[model samples]
Target: ATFEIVNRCSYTVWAAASKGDAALDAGGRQLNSGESWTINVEPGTNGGKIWARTDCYFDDSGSGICKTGDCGGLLRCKRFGRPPTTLAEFSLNQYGKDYIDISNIKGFNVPMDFSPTTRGCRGVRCAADIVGQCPAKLKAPGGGCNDACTVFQTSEYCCTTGKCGPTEYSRFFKRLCPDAFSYVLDKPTTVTCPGSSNYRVTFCPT
Candidate 1:
């Protein structure tokens, strides 16, 4: 499968993805506003993540840090990006379909749009202006909104144990991006796309 990474935002965005030791097409490369890149997902690849890093500064050696979604201070991520990031998760060929979601369960660093470019699949996205309207208690120092679990660390907010339901904190995010995962038990955010379809992930799409 292939993924087209698009940047519609006015600023630069460092798009990142990881699934084992594989490399992304423009992984860790600086994508200027209105630029785009494409990455190929090999056959049988499953359980991968895609995210955008913000406020980053890197050198020629590719060693630097990002204000948000920094992955071990490396330009190319060898693992999952840091917390308070908007995440696009996918598992291909799972039970005959591709399972995907835009997860804010960790938090949200930027707006995103995840959708199928091919005909066989529908679209799913989270394009809310969360950073500008983030709650005071849940605001990150760099930017974006922090998740309830990150902010409170309570059993109820984190859903560490027992039966749990939506709290006021989760409801706030839910009200903005209803299609995204706001809490640990937010199941409705997950969607099934047609396997092998081309997908487009855009940051700050208009």
Candidate 2:
């Protein structure tokens, strides 16, 4: 499968993808404003994540830290980044379908648009002003709107024991971006499309 990741945010965005060890253009790329990069996903990849890191200073060796979505200070992320990041997640060829979602379960950093470019399939977006709308209790240091679980680490927000309904914080996000996976157990966010589709993920989309 193919993915064209674009940056429309006016500032620099360092993009990172999980499953870096075995997939997707060695895991990371720095995208200046209006820049775009395309990566290939091997057919069998599963549960991979894509996100954007901001306000970073990286060396030629690709090692640096970002204000948001920092992954071990490495430009090439081998795993998922820290929380308070808007995410695009997918599992390809899972029982004959491709499952996709815009996940805010971690929280929101940059605005995003995750969509298919093939045929007439619908898209999902989490491009709200969540940072401005964030409740004070869940705001991060420099930027990003953090999740309740990340701030409180309680069973209510984390759903440690069982399926939990949406909390007030989750509802806040859900109300703003109905297409995002706001809480751990939020299920309606998942969407299914044919495995043959090519995708596009835009950061700070208009």
Candidate 3:
């Protein structure tokens, strides 16, 4: 199997997860250059699975998850371990020894595919969020128009009018709080975001 990943944050990422049933955690190694990454899943392994993410600094400036005003990017393969094991890795410092700013945070791309009527129920999946962005009103060196921040941290861009880009959270924010201007992280899903997951089961016997 082959897959690609993007690093949209300010820091660096080293490892990401590539297979099973485990909570969120880091797996791959650190990388930069807004490039793509390819991952290969060992054919005929123990019910294989895969995942990846980049290290992004939250505006909160907390430790562990992020440093005070000095955060990094990471792509992890969860569902593998507590800290997870890296299938592959790339360092940003190797590509460019400068910190990422608003000019070049447009994010990266990752494409993955899995096969084989495996014995396990898990498959590859990905989740992305805007780590943060330059002040909405400020113009980044990379260039942005009106309240738009062209750079993103682990997020893709959406080219549309009134349609927010990956780095723009207005839509996500509105879903969570339709009438309110701001929202807390722990709010109820119904009141905040409008999405759902439905499961279907099939049985076969001889």
Candidate 4:
């Protein structure tokens, strides 16, 4: 399918690896600030491994001071075109606390359908009866929790109370909402998870 890698680290590296033998080498190219290097890996008959690394030498390939802060994350999803049955993903932030997520297997095995998108806080149009999807009395639709804490945690927008929750949450919510808008934490803002470097890894079982 489609494969992506986000360097969610505070610093850059000489290079990075994928699986074992194959790697996404940045030595030849300069992946600077606010930039990510993505590639499409074809999974073998039996799913292979996906890993990363940096060059520790300054032989034109690296500057020797290569320090791969954090691999950001690792992921292996079914090929993009066909619906996927299983998806595995993880996020290792700058602090090393790995946030992992996996999708429950379904009949979804569409390969070309895999089009990984950005993680953020946005809501679609909903009817007034959004009682179950949204809280009973929210000022607006953007209040719902989601990933990319820029809207809520960073800007401190919406507020959530355990008693009046909108109920179901996705990976975007689980990863950031608790710390930013948790109804349980007293004197909120005391339990925010360090934001991860914007990196997404997607793989299809082509």
Q: Which residue pairs come into collision in candidate 2?
A: none
Best by lDDT: 2
TM-score (all chains, Cα) for each model: 0.93, 0.96, 0.26, 0.28
Model 2 lDDT-worst window of ten: 17-26
Tell me the tens digit of each residue's lDDT in model 4 across 97-204: 323333211111111111234343221111111112322332123222122222234222222332332222222222322222222222222211223322343222
lDDT of each: 0.84, 0.89, 0.27, 0.27
Q: Whose TM-score is greatest here?
A: 2
- Residue 81 shift from truth in candidate 1, angstroms: 1.4
Residue runs of model 2 more than 4 Å from their true location after superposition: 20-23
Q: Which stretches of candidate 3 lie over 4 Å from their true place?
A: 9-11, 20-27, 44-206
lDDT score of model 3?
0.27
Lowest lDDT sum, 10 consecutive residues, model 3, at 197-206
Candidate 1: segments with Cα more than 4 A from true spot: 20-27
Off by over 4 Å in 4: 8-10, 24-30, 45-57, 61-65, 68-199, 202-206
Cα error, candidate 3, residue 68 (Å)? 15
RMSD, every candidate, angstroms: 1.7, 1.4, 17.1, 16.8
Cα deviation in Å at residue 1, candidate 1? 0.6
Per-residue error for 124 in candidate 4, Å, reads: 22
